[PDB]
RNA sequence: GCAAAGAUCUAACGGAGAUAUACUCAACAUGCAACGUUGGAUACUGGAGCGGGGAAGGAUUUCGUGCCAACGGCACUCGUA
RNA sequence: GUCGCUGAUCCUUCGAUGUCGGCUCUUCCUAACCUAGCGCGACGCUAAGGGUUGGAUUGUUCACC
RNA sequence: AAAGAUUAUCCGUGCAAAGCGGAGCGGUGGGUAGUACUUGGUACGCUCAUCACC
RNA sequence: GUGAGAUUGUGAAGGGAUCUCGCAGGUAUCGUGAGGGAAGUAUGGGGUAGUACGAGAGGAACUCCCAUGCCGUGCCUCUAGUUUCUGGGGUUUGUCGAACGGCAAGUGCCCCGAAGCCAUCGCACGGUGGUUCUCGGCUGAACGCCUCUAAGCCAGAAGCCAAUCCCAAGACCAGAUGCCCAC
RNA sequence: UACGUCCCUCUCCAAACGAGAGAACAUGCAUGGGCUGGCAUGAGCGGCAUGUCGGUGGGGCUCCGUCCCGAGGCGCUGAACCUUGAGGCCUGAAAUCAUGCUCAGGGACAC
């Protein structure tokens, strides 16, 4: 299959891992969101911004380099 | 066989027959790997990486590790060692109100197996270190100085305060 | 009075008694029927369980909504070093069953085979097979071997070989045992003379798993389940729990019999041993027969996934370690824990259904870590995510002063 | 069966209560378990207190020196014995 | 017409055999509701191997939706 | 379960007819060179070396 | 014959008789299988086919494919549950002069959390033949007509028996085999 | 008599206790290193000391500027700590595992 990126952290999700979620207020271009970890889903529920969590790709790209 | 049944000299002979004969020779005969490898097409069928004792940071193929260690006279009565004990793996999921006493018993058993003694005396500094965070808060690691003595042998075990436990190994002082 | 409402009973009465198995190895209680038309061949092999993982494949099945689509399937990995053949036995039919005629032993045996006759091999005299060894090569011993082979030829109807495992070649640190496992393997096909010829040809030699089994066939598995000790009735038999306000406990069978018969019957559930039972399991399809890593490092590389990697996951198989020999990949699960020895057997049931005849082609084999939620397939992938770390900076600043 | 009231550890001293051995044997694998006092450590009661004084009831149970047969449902070198 | 397969007594037990219904669990029967075969849309023969449910009101068994 | 001066040579054969057959070459250690096997551990050709059976 | 005892109620030593049992097995593998247990079972769809049958209306079925319900035996790759790894972090009241380190609140409380265990809340697997009943026939008389029966044969049920599957020599296996002792 | 078996001792695919599977100077055990994973950026310093660039704070004291009090913020810092124990991996593919301890094992049967 194809490898998918996690919605919150952009961790790579390989075939047979993770969990997919579809919200009621769905976006037409991304009906389904993929989560690599329960920790990532919990942060997304609490509505944190990935750019402030130091172990995410967003944070690493804006700060480290 | 029993060393009080056979003489000490007889017991020595049986050990020698196995140690130098049919074990040491096999080693010298299987040396023939050099003869075969030198003839084997270079590269070519060189897929014989491990065999021949030609490899980086590997074991001595053909003999055990214990058969190569240096043997020495028995250690003297008075001897001093320094060691680290990993108490965390010994006290996992133990009932909370029993952790410090059980730690005392485990330390005694560890030192007793090491030094072949039944009389292991805990110094005040070590007892205080083991108890200094209450009955449930025993530290994960401890560093001990062990001194053996003869009056009947016994040990005195005491604490060695350290700043970090990283990189330290068992020493004889 | 009849019961008000009805349900099926709990548990299968054909698996009684629920007692501990007599031995730890799986032994085949029967072998597939002998068809004299075929070429002589062996019918089983011994392997060791090392963890499981999962794969991806496309499905070839007309009429199914999953036709030509990718599915994920879990698999079990079993390590299979070659076996060694040490003896030949024969059996004759009698009105009371099969009887052993004799045994032909090989001229030389291994130390690992001979260790199986002792409890303390190192501190012993180590004299097993010494008299047989010296007698078998004189003039009379040769005559006796000829005699027993002729008795096999005249009177035998079943031929089996004695084989044993090679733990020194297994090279595993958590399998503590050093004495070999021994078993009889029946020779099927041909006539009695052809069977004897094959068994005599492969004496004192070793046999690989790929010479007994092929990639896309199926097999039966004989093994012993995991033990759980003394278990209560709710877990052992699956009966229902009682209501909360029940005096004297809830995890019981309420009524264990009627007034008549004035007895407890063998059909009622009671507390006792659960687990450590022998089982024979039927149709396990072979997905891959893998070569040794020393010979071919790219064990888990497929045609569609060109990444170079071995069958061992990052961090090793939990509680087992590295797979270093030949191995087999089976679809699904098998009874027993990691590190236990099991027997593969050629199948008994008909193999004519579409699912059993299908040809299998793997597309992806998972090698992420089984500790935690593994998200990298290789160490190189992990090193691409994290750049250089502080430990690496220290290593590269203290390995350059020299 | 002796499971409510959270819990003890360590050294020295004391004591018949030990470090108690036939050959062989350096020490482990052939004397275990348990106690009083002092010092140190760790906890508990938590002022409606396992604090300090009285009435009713009890009557020497109070103090010192000894002793350890019986009694203190385990133990004692200790005791309201 | 024909021919077959609740009561009444007081034998045991008053120096005591724990009295309704439900829950749980096992087993047996056939006078066959379903599943399996036959003969004639319904009716009959063989067959007890496997199965035969969730709820409202009522302490109810029954009954009724 | 085996068949024979009353169960007191060996295979072959049908409880036959015939046909064989009866220093050597085994277990162990020492050199010596190539091979086979999953490749450290076993076999195999020469060669002495102590025990052997007959 | 050969060894060891004892001869058991009033002292200490000597030698006689009888009695008793010891005089051959031990230890370690691979198998056989009498007997006993015993299990798989339902529903839907496809196509067969809008075909056969029918004035029309309407409207079948077997081989063979694909799923699902229940039941059974396991397993832990994934997803979900569980934490006294008191793992890492956060946070309240008290407390060691402060910081550091912590500690008390019988696990203070909150989040995340490996390994292990575990769910029709996840995943895997669930075999073959003989006979014979109701019944359908064939040859065939009694009763030279006739008749599936009187002899005799053939097909035939989710029944019964066996096998596959589980236990297995008080079923006392001169079944085979490694080593030591005895003869 | 001998071959051997059991206890003590060590390991955990077994386990209420027996019984089982193993080992019996062995990378066996211990400690350390590396991996794999968990949490989420340690203590201390200083905003000029970190990696030819980039360097706080609502407010408030003192004698213009300068020196101080201040929750939180930034840098060193994907830091620090933990990682086998009822019992994860590596000393035998490749590219990377090191040291330390054992110094006649003891007892009972076999008899
Ligand atoms: K008791
Ligand atoms: Mg277990
Ligand atoms: Mg009640
Ligand atoms: Mg895991
Ligand atoms: Mg008690
Ligand atoms: Mg209590
Ligand atoms: Mg308090
Ligand atoms: Mg008392
Ligand atoms: Mg039977
Ligand atoms: Mg306190
Ligand atoms: Mg606390």
Tab-separated table of C-alpha atoms in Angstrom, chain C residues 7-323:
chain	number	residue	atom	x	y	z
C	7	UNK	CA	-28.731	-23.307	25.196
C	8	UNK	CA	-25.818	-25.420	23.938
C	9	UNK	CA	-23.452	-26.820	26.548
C	10	UNK	CA	-20.132	-25.158	27.363
C	11	UNK	CA	-17.019	-26.820	25.981
C	12	UNK	CA	-16.114	-29.770	23.776
C	13	UNK	CA	-16.240	-33.185	25.461
C	14	UNK	CA	-13.852	-34.702	22.901
C	15	UNK	CA	-10.867	-32.883	24.411
C	16	UNK	CA	-11.020	-34.592	27.814
C	17	UNK	CA	-9.315	-34.918	30.260
C	18	UNK	CA	-7.932	-31.393	30.660
C	19	UNK	CA	-4.658	-32.655	32.091
C	20	UNK	CA	-1.050	-31.674	31.513
C	21	UNK	CA	0.496	-33.163	28.394
C	22	UNK	CA	2.866	-36.100	28.830
C	23	UNK	CA	5.699	-34.382	26.925
C	24	UNK	CA	6.659	-30.872	25.857
C	25	UNK	CA	7.313	-31.575	22.167
C	26	UNK	CA	4.597	-31.979	19.567
C	27	UNK	CA	4.383	-35.533	18.260
C	28	UNK	CA	2.270	-36.584	15.290
C	29	UNK	CA	-0.179	-39.271	16.367
C	30	UNK	CA	-0.706	-40.379	12.746
C	31	UNK	CA	0.856	-39.849	9.330
C	32	UNK	CA	-0.855	-39.327	5.964
C	33	UNK	CA	-1.912	-42.432	4.069
C	34	UNK	CA	0.853	-44.080	2.066
C	35	UNK	CA	0.386	-43.929	-1.717
C	36	UNK	CA	2.847	-46.391	-3.257
C	37	UNK	CA	2.758	-44.690	-6.677
C	38	UNK	CA	4.741	-41.615	-5.624
C	39	UNK	CA	8.478	-41.186	-5.135
C	40	UNK	CA	9.790	-41.864	-1.600
C	41	UNK	CA	9.919	-38.753	0.586
C	42	UNK	CA	9.872	-37.548	4.198
C	43	UNK	CA	6.722	-36.307	5.914
C	44	UNK	CA	7.655	-33.983	8.814
C	45	UNK	CA	10.218	-31.555	10.277
C	46	UNK	CA	10.910	-29.788	13.586
C	47	UNK	CA	10.909	-25.986	14.032
C	48	UNK	CA	11.055	-23.352	16.802
C	49	UNK	CA	8.564	-20.497	17.225
C	50	UNK	CA	10.003	-16.952	17.079
C	51	UNK	CA	7.270	-14.306	17.291
C	52	UNK	CA	4.835	-13.027	14.665
C	53	UNK	CA	4.315	-10.063	12.319
C	54	UNK	CA	2.071	-9.127	9.360
C	55	UNK	CA	2.199	-8.856	5.544
C	56	UNK	CA	0.370	-7.292	2.585
C	57	UNK	CA	-0.724	-9.164	-0.541
C	58	UNK	CA	-3.100	-8.981	-3.502
C	59	UNK	CA	-5.903	-11.541	-3.607
C	60	UNK	CA	-6.732	-13.712	-6.630
C	61	UNK	CA	-10.276	-14.956	-6.061
C	62	UNK	CA	-13.008	-14.564	-8.712
C	63	UNK	CA	-16.446	-13.740	-7.363
C	64	UNK	CA	-15.212	-12.095	-4.160
C	65	UNK	CA	-15.578	-8.399	-3.412
C	66	UNK	CA	-11.908	-8.534	-2.365
C	67	UNK	CA	-10.778	-9.713	-5.824
C	68	UNK	CA	-7.590	-8.013	-7.036
C	69	UNK	CA	-7.305	-5.950	-3.849
C	70	UNK	CA	-4.707	-5.629	-1.114
C	71	UNK	CA	-5.215	-7.335	2.251
C	72	UNK	CA	-3.190	-7.383	5.469
C	73	UNK	CA	-2.581	-10.788	7.049
C	74	UNK	CA	-0.775	-11.761	10.275
C	75	UNK	CA	1.885	-14.473	10.077
C	76	UNK	CA	4.059	-16.554	12.411
C	77	UNK	CA	7.825	-17.023	11.959
C	78	UNK	CA	9.396	-20.373	12.845
C	79	UNK	CA	13.150	-21.028	12.763
C	80	UNK	CA	14.209	-24.221	10.971
C	81	UNK	CA	17.838	-25.381	11.142
C	82	UNK	CA	18.607	-28.658	9.331
C	83	UNK	CA	17.946	-32.004	10.997
C	84	UNK	CA	20.329	-34.975	11.091
C	85	UNK	CA	19.390	-38.605	10.335
C	86	UNK	CA	20.865	-41.217	12.692
C	87	UNK	CA	18.835	-44.421	12.361
C	88	UNK	CA	16.338	-46.626	10.547
C	89	UNK	CA	13.424	-48.582	12.047
C	90	UNK	CA	10.852	-50.898	10.508
C	91	UNK	CA	7.450	-52.198	11.549
C	92	UNK	CA	5.445	-55.324	10.798
C	93	UNK	CA	1.692	-55.856	11.036
C	94	UNK	CA	0.224	-58.284	13.563
C	95	UNK	CA	-3.342	-59.068	14.669
C	96	UNK	CA	-2.576	-56.865	17.698
C	97	UNK	CA	-0.935	-53.933	15.923
C	98	UNK	CA	2.390	-52.729	14.577
C	99	UNK	CA	5.622	-54.118	16.024
C	100	UNK	CA	9.165	-52.797	15.718
C	101	UNK	CA	11.460	-55.255	13.944
C	102	UNK	CA	14.851	-53.681	14.643
C	103	UNK	CA	16.992	-50.564	14.448
C	104	UNK	CA	19.949	-49.773	12.199
C	105	UNK	CA	22.183	-47.118	13.767
C	106	UNK	CA	24.615	-44.844	11.975
C	107	UNK	CA	28.347	-45.408	12.351
C	108	UNK	CA	28.925	-42.000	13.967
C	109	UNK	CA	26.636	-39.863	16.098
C	110	UNK	CA	26.828	-36.325	17.426
C	111	UNK	CA	27.573	-35.206	20.949
C	112	UNK	CA	24.242	-33.368	20.914
C	113	UNK	CA	22.425	-36.609	20.070
C	114	UNK	CA	24.309	-38.527	22.759
C	115	UNK	CA	23.626	-35.872	25.419
C	116	UNK	CA	19.961	-36.984	25.308
C	117	UNK	CA	20.799	-40.121	27.352
C	118	UNK	CA	22.078	-38.263	30.448
C	119	UNK	CA	20.933	-35.885	33.161
C	120	UNK	CA	24.432	-34.527	33.946
C	121	UNK	CA	26.455	-35.026	30.771
C	122	UNK	CA	29.465	-32.903	31.721
C	123	UNK	CA	30.207	-34.684	35.001
C	124	UNK	CA	29.840	-38.221	33.619
C	125	UNK	CA	31.914	-40.856	31.846
C	126	UNK	CA	30.260	-40.174	28.456
C	127	UNK	CA	30.269	-43.786	27.241
C	128	UNK	CA	26.987	-43.900	25.284
C	129	UNK	CA	27.212	-45.909	22.024
C	130	UNK	CA	30.884	-46.838	22.548
C	131	UNK	CA	30.368	-50.615	22.514
C	132	UNK	CA	27.950	-50.413	19.581
C	133	UNK	CA	30.427	-48.171	17.772
C	134	UNK	CA	33.321	-50.574	18.070
C	135	UNK	CA	31.254	-53.720	17.449
C	136	UNK	CA	29.434	-52.472	14.358
C	137	UNK	CA	32.604	-52.399	12.250
C	138	UNK	CA	33.978	-55.882	12.890
C	139	UNK	CA	33.142	-58.858	10.689
C	140	UNK	CA	30.140	-59.916	12.788
C	141	UNK	CA	28.579	-56.461	13.107
C	142	UNK	CA	28.431	-56.087	9.337
C	143	UNK	CA	26.685	-59.459	9.138
C	144	UNK	CA	24.139	-58.327	11.735
C	145	UNK	CA	23.391	-55.119	9.828
C	146	UNK	CA	22.874	-57.152	6.661
C	147	UNK	CA	20.534	-59.484	8.548
C	148	UNK	CA	18.393	-56.680	9.931
C	149	UNK	CA	18.150	-54.902	6.578
C	150	UNK	CA	16.988	-58.166	4.994
C	151	UNK	CA	14.392	-58.545	7.750
C	152	UNK	CA	13.147	-55.047	6.912
C	153	UNK	CA	12.978	-56.023	3.248
C	154	UNK	CA	11.093	-59.263	3.897
C	155	UNK	CA	8.638	-58.413	6.660
C	156	UNK	CA	8.290	-54.648	7.050
C	157	UNK	CA	5.388	-52.577	5.812
C	158	UNK	CA	6.266	-49.204	7.408
C	159	UNK	CA	9.695	-47.529	7.325
C	160	UNK	CA	10.672	-44.583	9.523
C	161	UNK	CA	13.935	-42.723	10.126
C	162	UNK	CA	15.216	-41.381	13.439
C	163	UNK	CA	16.175	-37.702	13.252
C	164	UNK	CA	17.334	-35.022	15.655
C	165	UNK	CA	17.742	-31.253	15.935
C	166	UNK	CA	20.971	-29.182	15.988
C	167	UNK	CA	20.954	-26.728	18.888
C	168	UNK	CA	24.577	-25.709	18.302
C	169	UNK	CA	23.468	-24.496	14.871
C	170	UNK	CA	20.360	-22.864	16.336
C	171	UNK	CA	22.666	-20.573	18.398
C	172	UNK	CA	19.879	-19.072	20.544
C	173	UNK	CA	20.581	-17.615	23.980
C	174	UNK	CA	17.160	-18.073	25.581
C	175	UNK	CA	16.646	-21.721	24.611
C	176	UNK	CA	18.674	-23.152	27.469
C	177	UNK	CA	18.618	-26.798	26.370
C	178	UNK	CA	21.682	-28.418	24.786
C	179	UNK	CA	20.539	-32.033	24.309
C	180	UNK	CA	18.942	-32.715	20.942
C	181	UNK	CA	15.268	-33.407	20.299
C	182	UNK	CA	14.673	-36.791	18.647
C	183	UNK	CA	11.743	-38.074	16.603
C	184	UNK	CA	10.710	-40.687	14.051
C	185	UNK	CA	9.747	-39.477	10.567
C	186	UNK	CA	7.841	-41.880	8.329
C	187	UNK	CA	8.903	-42.425	4.705
C	188	UNK	CA	5.938	-42.370	2.308
C	189	UNK	CA	5.849	-43.389	-1.332
C	190	UNK	CA	7.330	-46.156	-3.436
C	191	UNK	CA	7.773	-49.741	-2.319
C	192	UNK	CA	9.493	-51.072	0.796
C	193	UNK	CA	12.782	-51.600	-1.052
C	194	UNK	CA	12.764	-48.043	-2.414
C	195	UNK	CA	11.984	-46.693	1.057
C	196	UNK	CA	14.917	-48.633	2.517
C	197	UNK	CA	17.224	-47.361	-0.228
C	198	UNK	CA	16.301	-43.717	0.407
C	199	UNK	CA	16.657	-44.098	4.174
C	200	UNK	CA	20.058	-45.729	3.770
C	201	UNK	CA	21.230	-43.031	1.362
C	202	UNK	CA	20.466	-40.232	3.806
C	203	UNK	CA	22.181	-41.774	6.852
C	204	UNK	CA	24.492	-39.526	8.933
C	205	UNK	CA	23.508	-36.585	6.696
C	206	UNK	CA	21.408	-33.488	7.257
C	207	UNK	CA	18.071	-32.508	5.749
C	208	UNK	CA	16.738	-29.009	5.039
C	209	UNK	CA	13.129	-27.916	5.456
C	210	UNK	CA	12.901	-26.839	1.807
C	211	UNK	CA	13.405	-30.474	0.770
C	212	UNK	CA	10.279	-31.490	2.702
C	213	UNK	CA	7.926	-28.551	2.101
C	214	UNK	CA	7.254	-26.184	-0.798
C	215	UNK	CA	6.319	-22.535	-0.684
C	216	UNK	CA	2.609	-22.366	-1.466
C	217	UNK	CA	1.369	-25.643	0.039
C	218	UNK	CA	-0.230	-26.157	3.443
C	219	UNK	CA	0.721	-28.185	6.489
C	220	UNK	CA	-0.539	-29.463	9.814
C	221	UNK	CA	1.044	-28.318	13.074
C	222	UNK	CA	1.477	-30.439	16.208
C	223	UNK	CA	2.303	-28.564	19.414
C	224	UNK	CA	1.504	-27.927	23.084
C	225	UNK	CA	-0.467	-24.867	24.236
C	226	UNK	CA	0.662	-22.292	26.812
C	227	UNK	CA	0.170	-23.189	30.464
C	228	UNK	CA	-1.881	-21.274	33.016
C	229	UNK	CA	-1.871	-23.580	36.054
C	230	UNK	CA	-4.992	-24.011	38.169
C	231	UNK	CA	-7.914	-22.096	36.675
C	232	UNK	CA	-11.466	-21.460	37.804
C	233	UNK	CA	-14.600	-22.548	36.038
C	234	UNK	CA	-15.355	-19.190	34.367
C	235	UNK	CA	-12.074	-19.145	32.433
C	236	UNK	CA	-11.625	-22.915	32.070
C	237	UNK	CA	-15.082	-23.629	30.612
C	238	UNK	CA	-16.747	-20.286	29.850
C	239	UNK	CA	-19.778	-20.514	32.160
C	240	UNK	CA	-21.650	-17.351	33.179
C	241	UNK	CA	-20.989	-15.225	36.268
C	242	UNK	CA	-23.681	-14.980	38.956
C	243	UNK	CA	-25.447	-11.780	40.127
C	244	UNK	CA	-23.747	-9.274	42.417
C	245	UNK	CA	-25.759	-10.054	45.568
C	246	UNK	CA	-24.915	-13.809	45.584
C	247	UNK	CA	-23.733	-15.052	48.976
C	248	UNK	CA	-20.459	-17.031	49.023
C	249	UNK	CA	-19.048	-15.886	45.689
C	250	UNK	CA	-20.051	-15.372	42.065
C	251	UNK	CA	-17.580	-17.258	39.826
C	252	UNK	CA	-19.150	-20.707	40.189
C	253	UNK	CA	-21.584	-23.166	38.672
C	254	UNK	CA	-24.766	-22.829	40.718
C	255	UNK	CA	-26.128	-26.396	40.414
C	256	UNK	CA	-23.770	-29.323	39.819
C	257	UNK	CA	-26.480	-31.962	39.496
C	258	UNK	CA	-29.944	-33.261	40.220
C	259	UNK	CA	-30.991	-35.472	43.119
C	260	UNK	CA	-30.884	-38.542	40.867
C	261	UNK	CA	-28.429	-39.895	39.832
C	262	UNK	CA	-26.955	-39.359	43.330
C	263	UNK	CA	-23.618	-38.528	41.752
C	264	UNK	CA	-21.636	-35.830	39.983
C	265	UNK	CA	-21.363	-36.563	36.261
C	266	UNK	CA	-18.289	-36.260	34.047
C	267	UNK	CA	-20.112	-33.605	31.979
C	268	UNK	CA	-20.160	-30.878	34.677
C	269	UNK	CA	-17.576	-28.083	34.754
C	270	UNK	CA	-14.995	-28.008	37.582
C	271	UNK	CA	-11.841	-26.068	38.447
C	272	UNK	CA	-8.507	-27.519	37.375
C	273	UNK	CA	-5.573	-27.340	34.990
C	274	UNK	CA	-5.888	-25.098	31.943
C	275	UNK	CA	-3.312	-24.966	29.177
C	276	UNK	CA	-0.295	-27.121	28.377
C	277	UNK	CA	-2.353	-29.486	26.196
C	278	UNK	CA	-1.338	-31.186	22.962
C	279	UNK	CA	-3.172	-30.048	19.824
C	280	UNK	CA	-3.075	-30.882	16.110
C	281	UNK	CA	-4.068	-27.928	13.909
C	282	UNK	CA	-5.148	-28.432	10.343
C	283	UNK	CA	-4.634	-26.142	7.352
C	284	UNK	CA	-1.773	-23.657	7.730
C	285	UNK	CA	-0.576	-22.197	4.446
C	286	UNK	CA	3.146	-21.611	3.916
C	287	UNK	CA	3.818	-18.064	2.744
C	288	UNK	CA	7.629	-18.085	2.547
C	289	UNK	CA	10.520	-20.495	3.024
C	290	UNK	CA	13.443	-18.213	3.796
C	291	UNK	CA	17.163	-18.811	3.361
C	292	UNK	CA	19.730	-18.187	6.089
C	293	UNK	CA	20.817	-14.527	6.604
C	294	UNK	CA	24.528	-15.428	6.200
C	295	UNK	CA	23.665	-16.705	2.712
C	296	UNK	CA	21.070	-14.104	1.660
C	297	UNK	CA	20.808	-10.890	3.778
C	298	UNK	CA	17.763	-9.495	1.913
C	299	UNK	CA	15.305	-11.844	3.566
C	300	UNK	CA	12.277	-9.520	3.789
C	301	UNK	CA	12.788	-7.618	0.531
C	302	UNK	CA	9.983	-8.189	-1.973
C	303	UNK	CA	9.633	-7.397	-5.661
C	304	UNK	CA	7.411	-4.399	-4.859
C	305	UNK	CA	9.361	-3.187	-1.804
C	306	UNK	CA	13.026	-2.827	-2.733
C	307	UNK	CA	14.252	-1.874	0.747
C	308	UNK	CA	17.068	-4.155	1.909
C	309	UNK	CA	16.216	-5.731	5.257
C	310	UNK	CA	16.111	-9.022	7.144
C	311	UNK	CA	13.170	-10.837	8.738
C	312	UNK	CA	14.214	-9.757	12.240
C	313	UNK	CA	12.423	-6.615	13.487
C	314	UNK	CA	14.188	-3.602	14.940
C	315	UNK	CA	15.107	-4.400	18.524
C	316	UNK	CA	14.763	-8.164	17.977
C	317	UNK	CA	11.956	-10.624	18.596
C	318	UNK	CA	10.802	-9.921	22.150
C	319	UNK	CA	12.141	-12.628	24.430
C	320	UNK	CA	13.645	-14.598	21.531
C	321	UNK	CA	16.287	-12.606	19.673
C	322	UNK	CA	17.601	-12.855	16.128
C	323	UNK	CA	16.596	-15.433	13.532
